[PDB]
Structure formats: structure tokens, C-alpha cells
Amino acid sequence: RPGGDTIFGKIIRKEIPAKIIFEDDRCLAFHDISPQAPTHFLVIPKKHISQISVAEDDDESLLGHLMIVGKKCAADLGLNKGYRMVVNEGSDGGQSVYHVHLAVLGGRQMHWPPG
Amino acid sequence: GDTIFGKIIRKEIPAKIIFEDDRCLAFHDISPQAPTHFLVIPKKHISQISVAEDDDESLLGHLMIVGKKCAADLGLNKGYRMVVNEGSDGGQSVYHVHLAVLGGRQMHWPPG
Ligand SMILES: Nc1ncnc2c1ncn2[C@@H]1O[C@H](CO)[C@@H](O)[C@H]1O
């Protein structure tokens, strides 16, 4: 509206506060309010895409940008020992907000399997 | 490159291939952690996501779109989880960038 009225769309439009790490014209990185690792943040597109399963072919650059921004933010946040990037899709993926997001978790040893 | 994923790309050792194009390969993981568990990897040898170049941005997105399409082809209509591991804390097992896609069961939180 632009960004939609999911909570993530509201965050994009500064209508709900968030702890922002990085912002550009395509995406926003901000900390997760329910962290599952010592560092846990999200990278979201400003364009509303509900879930990765409905992303268009022409969304490739944008999706890749989420990953590049995620890795840059992880470096800026000092995650020199590594981290895990996660995209949850739908019910089995554990998706809770239908605005696609890349989660980045680090600052501890991550285990296998990844859930 | 110089990892087992390079050997798989070069067809030197076998893998159950799901999809291929000029720039990536998708194949079932040898150690599956879900009823469906596959990888999408670039043919370009990027060792880890932390060293990916800005110019690789659309290639990385291509891995995700290919992962989405393969998931649908493999019947993952209830959802799935995509994972990229970086470094030792991330549990990265092979130093060749890979996007893992897992589904066919409920995935749990935290994701490791
Ligand atoms: N207002 C919010 N600010 C930051 N993260 C959020 C917010 N609401 C939900 N999340 C996080 O989004 C993730 C998936 O929707 C979860 O890890 C959850 O904690």
C-alpha cells in the first residue's frame, strides 16, 4: 500500500517500529523480535511478495539482492564465524507472515537438521 | 571447482539430478533430512555466500527460483524450507554455495 498491510508492510512504511540494520530502494533488513540465535535478523523486499512459491521469474534479481544484503549485514554485524540463511514457505516451512523474508541467524553454532 | 559438488557438476560422480540448465544444477541430497531434501547449486564456483560478488546477485536469485520450481514439481504443496549455510557456525558442509530445499514434513523452529 505500498508494501501491503502485513506487519512487514507496516514496518516498511514506518507505521510500526523496528530495529533497522539496512535499507535501500529494494529491501529492508531489521532484527527479529523473537530471536532464535544471538543475532537473528530478517531481510524483506519492499515489493510485496506473499511467499517464495508465488515469486515471478522477473523477481530473480530482487531475491538475489535479499541474499547479498543478508550476507553484507551479517558481516557488518560481526558474524565472522558464520550464519544460516532461511526462507520459510507455507505451513510445512513454518511461515508465519505472508510477506517473503530471508532470516539470518548466527552468533552460535547452528545444528543439523535445520528444523 | 575442487569439491565433491564440482565433481557432481562435471558428471564425474553420480547424483540424482532433478533439474539442470546452463548455470545451475539441482539434485537430491545424499543425506536427506526430510522426505524431500534437494540442493540447488551454481555451476560457478562460489565457495561461500560471504564471498559472493554483487554481480552474482541474479544468479543467486536464479537458484531460489529454480528451487521454487523444483519444489512444486516434487509435490511440496504444503510448503518447505530453503537454507543457505555459511561457515562453521552455519554448519556449511561443502565450500561450494548451495541452496538446500527441505519439505514433505513439518519443519520446526528454531531452524537448528
Ligand atoms: N514486529 C516484528 N518485528 C520483527 N520481527 C517480527 C515481528 N513480527 C514477527 N516477527 C518475526 O518474523 C519471523 C517470521 O514471521 C519470526 O521470527 C517473528 O519473530
Numbering used by the authors:
A (entry chain A): 12 to 126
B (entry chain B): 15 to 126
Report text from the authors:
Diadenosine-5′,5-P1,P4-tetraphosphate (Ap4A) is a ubiquitous second messenger from bacteria to higher eukaryotes, which responds to environmental stresses and cell cycle phases. Ap4A then binds to the histidine triad nucleotide-binding protein 1 (HINT1), thereby disrupting the protein–protein interaction with microphthalmia-associated transcription factor (MITF), and the released MITF eventually promotes the transcription of mast cell activation genes. The HINT1 protein is a compact and symmetric dimer, with two adenosine pockets at opposite sides. Here we report that Ap4A specifically polymerizes HINT1 into (HINT1-Ap4A)n (HAn) filaments in solution and in the activated RBL cells.
We then made an H114A mutant to inactivate the hydrolysis activity of HINT1. Finally, to reveal the molecular specificity of Ap4A to induce HAn, we further solved the co-crystal structures of HINT1H114A-ATP and HINT1H114A-Ap3A. Only the AMP portion of these molecules were resolved in the adenosine pockets of HINT1, with the remaining atoms of ATP or Ap3A untraceable. Neither ATP (with only one adenosine moiety) nor Ap3A (with a shorter phosphodiester linkage) could recruit HINT1 dimers to form polymer in solution. Our results show that Ap3A, Ap5A, AMP, and ATP could not induce HINT1 polymerization. The five-phosphate linkage in Ap5A adopted a bent and zigzag conformation compared with the straight conformation of Ap4A, suggesting that the increased length of Ap5A is too long to stabilize the HAn interface as Ap4A does. Together, these results indicate that the bivalent characteristic, the length of the phosphodiester linkage, and the interaction of phosphates of Ap4A with HINT1 were all critical for HAn formation.
